[PDB]
Amino acid sequence: QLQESGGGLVQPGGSLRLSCRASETLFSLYAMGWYRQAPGKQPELIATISGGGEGTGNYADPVKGRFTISRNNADNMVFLQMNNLKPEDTAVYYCNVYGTNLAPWGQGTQVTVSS
Amino acid sequence: ATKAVCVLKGDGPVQGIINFEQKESNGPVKVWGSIKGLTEGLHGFHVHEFGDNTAGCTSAGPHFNPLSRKHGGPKDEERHVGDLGNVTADKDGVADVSIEDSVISLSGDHCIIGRTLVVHEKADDLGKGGNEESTKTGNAGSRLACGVIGIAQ
Amino acid sequence: QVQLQESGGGSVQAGGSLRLACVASGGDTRPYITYWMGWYRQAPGKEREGVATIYTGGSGTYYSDSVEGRFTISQDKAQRTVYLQMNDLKPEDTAMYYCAAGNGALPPGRRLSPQNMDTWGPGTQVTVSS
Amino acid sequence: LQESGGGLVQAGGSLRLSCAASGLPYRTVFMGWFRQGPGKEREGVAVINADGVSTYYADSVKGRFTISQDNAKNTVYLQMNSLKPEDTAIYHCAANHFFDYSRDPLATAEYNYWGQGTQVTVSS
Ligand SMILES: [Zn+2]
Structure with missing residues (x-):
């Protein structure tokens, strides 16, 4: 369902690009x-993407101005580009619907920040 | 047995109709109807306080918060009285709304008759957005359509 | 004004x-x-x-109902362009093809009606010979 | 959400x-019973709606269990008969102040108010 x-692993000051494929029934929610x-x-909500067309993205406070979220509608895929990574961002990242009930959690991806 | 209705009209093509029903005094309230012209996905859905429509939907004011609380999802205890969560519009943009909320009421202190039903552009984050605008409006975006809630019966 | 072509x-x-x-x-x-x-x-x-x-x-x-799985219409939203794939053509489809846009809140049934259609395009001729 | 009854x-x-809704700020939208085997x-x-007739049952307990509401004591009763050994479960009472009808009236994700939870166990 989620992928x-x-x-x-990334040194402090690097960047990463997390991709998540989401099924059509979950991506058609466009949130x-x-x-x-x-x-x-708790798995706090870092970044959100919702709206028509390419969609509008919102970001929390600890990542405001460093992370950027986007989506490919033809692919039903969500992208997260994390720039200027800090050790506080070492976490397991997941991608799931928000604004409604959360789909079953995928496997996620580990993101570790150390040199 | 109080029945209300609201005709959401706006500058864009988004328009629709949402009826409200309440069988008891200070009991559950059904909210059902249909919106059309929206984009496919989750749109914000709130009951803003002022029933003003002079300067458009911006005249509606903030979400109906009599208890003076923060923003959240509808099923959460910390939420505006006017917080009804999000609506879903399918591939045709047809948001078939059907909801049962015991926080709103057609009478008493939580009366929503005369308040502005407002559908939004993006989705509400139900107060979990992780910033200040999520604890107020819920980052639902702009206000696409709005209408004054009036008594139907 | 929303002009089509x-x-x-x-x-x-x-x-x-x-x-x-x-x-x-x-x-x-x-x-x-x-x-x-x-x-x-x-x-x-x-x-x-x-x-x-x-x-x-x-x-x-x-x-x-006049076209089964012969036609297929898609949309590039990032280019605001609508495509129509016309395969297995029949000699009766020889006509003029105009693309137009109506209100997105059109009730079902009025979506494919030319009376409830706003702006219209110039049009191009697609003739099919047998 | 106080629960009463149960055992072996x-x-x-x-x-x-029986489950009596206690100290709830708002009225009930959907009250009922879940279980953990x-x-x-x-x-x-x-589960059952505020109207007292709208009910929703699981397919495992369809035909067998029976939910009702007393409303006088805003109490909901569940009568479970011919209990099978699969009915061995901690039964949890569930409440709601909101419900989206386009979702499942039988998911744990749809309810935020929960009770202590009794135990209903069956032999054989
Ligand atoms: Zn609110």
Whole structure:
């Protein structure tokens, strides 16, 4: 249903591009979101993408101005580009619908920030 | 047995009709109807406070918050009285709305008759957006269509 | 004003493949403004028929009863362009093909009607010889 | 959400659970019963609307269980008969102040108010 990929090990100050394929029935909701998960805390909603056309993206406070979210409608795929990574961003990232009930969680992708 | 209705009209092609029904006093309220002209996906859906339509939907004011609380999803305890969550529009843009909410009411302190039903452009994040605009409007975007809620019966 | 313009037509053998594209220009560019974009067929001495229609806010396609799985209409929203694939053509489809757009909140049944259609395109001739 | 009744029964016995909505800020939209089997997910048993007639049952308990509402004590009763050994479950009472009718009236994702949870176990 969800299919996350693109993360891994990255030194402080690098960048990553996380991709998630989402099924047609979940992507037709056109209100996707990249959440981050630190061991112990909740998978807080980091970035959201919703709206017509290419969609409009919103971002939380700790990533405002560093991360950018986008989507491919023909592919039913969501992209997250993380620039100027900090050690606080080391987390497991998932991609799931927001604004409505959360679909079952995918496998996600690990994103570790150390040198 | 109080019945209300609201005709959402706006500058764009988005328009629709949403009726409200309440069988009891301070009981559950059914909210059903149909919107059309929207984009496919999740759109914001709220009951803003002022029933003004002079300067368009911007005259509606903020979400109906009598209890003075933060923003959230409808099923959450911390939410505006006027917070009804999001609506879904299919490939045809036809948002078939059907909802049952016991927080709103057609009478009493939580009366929504005379308040502005407003559909939004993007989706509401139900207060979990992780910033300040999610704790107010819910980053639902702009206000595509709005209408004054009036008594149907 | 939302001005339309079609292209891709020509003389095609009985059984060919054609791509009728229509690139929208001007008008209100805001993305939350949805239309119902339809291709309409007027035969010399007949009326405007209407083959296929598509929603610019989603991906709903509707086809009249006169074309089965011969036509297929798609939309590049990033280029504001609507495409119509015309394959397995029949010699009766020789007519003029106009692309037009109506209000995106059109009730079902009025989506593929030329009376409930706003702006119209110039039109191009697609003749099919047997 | 206070719960009452339950315990143990044999293969083909009976039982009746009751849930009284206590200290709720708003009125009830959908009140009912879910259950968690021995090492299984919390699955929807039987729920009922505020009107007292709109009911929704699971296919495992279809025909067998029966939900009702007293409204006087805003209490919901579930009568479970001919309980099978699969009916061994911690039964959890569930409430709602909102419900989207385009969703499942039997999902744990659709309810935020929950109770202590009784135990209903069956022999054989
Ligand atoms: Zn609100």
